[PDB]
Amino acid sequence: MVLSEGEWQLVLHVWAKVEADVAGHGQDILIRLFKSHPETLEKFDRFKHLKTEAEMKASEDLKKWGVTVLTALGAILKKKGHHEAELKPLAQSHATKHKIPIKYLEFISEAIIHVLHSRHPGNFGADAQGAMNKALELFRKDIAAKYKELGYQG
Numbered sequence: 025m026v027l028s029e030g031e032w033q034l035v036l037h038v039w040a041k042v043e044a045d046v047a048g049h050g051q052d053i054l055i056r057l058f059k060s061h062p063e064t065l066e067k068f069d070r071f072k073h074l075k076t077e078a079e080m081k082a083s084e085d086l087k088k089w090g091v092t093v094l095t096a097l098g099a100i101l102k103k104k105g106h107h108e109a110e111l112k113p114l115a116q117s118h119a120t121k122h123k124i125p126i127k128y129l130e131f132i133s134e135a136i137i138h139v140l141h142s143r144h145p146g147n148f149g150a151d152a153q154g155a156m157n158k159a160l161e162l163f164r165k166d167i168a169a170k171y172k173e174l175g176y177q178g
């Protein structure tokens with residue numbers, strides 16, 4: 025839960041690359057999530073009728089939601105762990121409305137790592153991977169704690 029300064033800078037350095045193309049990274053990540061863990065697709069009534077990869081690729085709406093998701097994540101990462109304010113609304117909606125278990129957040133964490141490797145063969149190596157994994161694990165543990173604070177089991 026306590027990352028080094030150097031680890032946070034690895035996280036934010038690669039995130040700067042994500043921010044050069046938020047929608048593309050976002051679409052890539054959701055497509056990867058749905059492919060690797062198809063049960064997650066059922067959480068999205070708006071996407072569950074995209075039945076092939078050609079269909080997912082062509083979904084402009086999916087790109088837009090990629091932006092929605094990554095924009096929230098980016099703001100969280102930039103807080104370097106001091107993300108209580110950002111987690112409040114997100115835990116509320118994800119615990120009580122969307123009903124996303126923490127395990128699904130582990131699934132999307134894996135998709136994020138995968139896409140960062142795919143998109144950044146030059147500057148997302150072992151150290152950057154380790155750092156990003158720590159940052160995403162912190163997010164998951166803290167949001168799990170917030171679910172519980174709200175009275176919910178993630």
Ligand code: HEM
Binds near residue numbers: 118
């Ligand atoms: C990094 C992890 C995630 C972030 C930062 C994130 C962020 C967001 C944001 C900002 C919204 C819109 C505002 C809101 O309702 O809170 C949203 C909506 C939503 N999210 Fe998440 N999300 C994440 C992971 C997931 C995962 C893994 C799933 C399902 C497997 C999921 C399911 C949904 C659904 C179903 C909605 C509403 C979609 C709709 O209204 O059509 N989220 N998310």
